[PDB]
């Protein structure tokens, strides 16, 4: 210092939400899938250790943890909600994780299905060269 490396990576969070043909046994109206992915083609597997989806409390095992791609959870439900997502890096220093509060929103019946994409830029300031090597392999 004063010198600085600023490594930037791109992340993509999104979800699909369809109405089923007919509700489940529990009368679940919708089918949805939410994901965390890199842009084409990437492979965030190099620097991402695990992704943690925090579903609503009304779900069994609401804390879903994907430590291998694809980073996604497939579920059926009746309503939308705010879904905290935590991305952990293969990193020994701060930040060791980043948190996004994803709006997994549903559309009403007699309306088009949901296909939402949310792009996020991550900036790591002066990372170690090992973590940088991981970030650059993506």
């Amino acid at each position: 210092m004063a010198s600085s490396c600023a490594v930037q990576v791109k992340l993509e969070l999104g979800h699909r939400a369809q109405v089923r043909k007919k509700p489940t046994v529990e009368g679940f109206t919708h089918d949805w899938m939410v994901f965390v992915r890199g842009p084409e083609h990437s492979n965030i597997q190099h620097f991402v250790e695990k992704v943690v989806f925090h579903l609503h409390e009304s779900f069994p095992r609401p804390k879903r943890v994907c430590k291998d791609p694809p980073y996604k959870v497939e579920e059926s439900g009746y309503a939308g909600f705010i879904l905290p997502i935590e991305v952990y890096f293969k990193n020994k220093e701060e930040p060791r994780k980043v948190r996004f509060d994803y709006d997994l929103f549903l559309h009403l019946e007699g309306h088009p299905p949901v296909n939402h994409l949310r792009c996020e830029k991550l900036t790591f300031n002066n990372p170690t060269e090992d973590f940088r090597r991981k970030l650059l392999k993506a």
């Binding site: 309503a79 939308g80 909600f81 705010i82 929103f105 009403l108």
Partner: peptide, 5 residues
């Protein structure tokens, strides 16, 4: 649109 909130 229903949200649990």
């Amino acid at each position: 649109a229903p949200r649990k909130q």
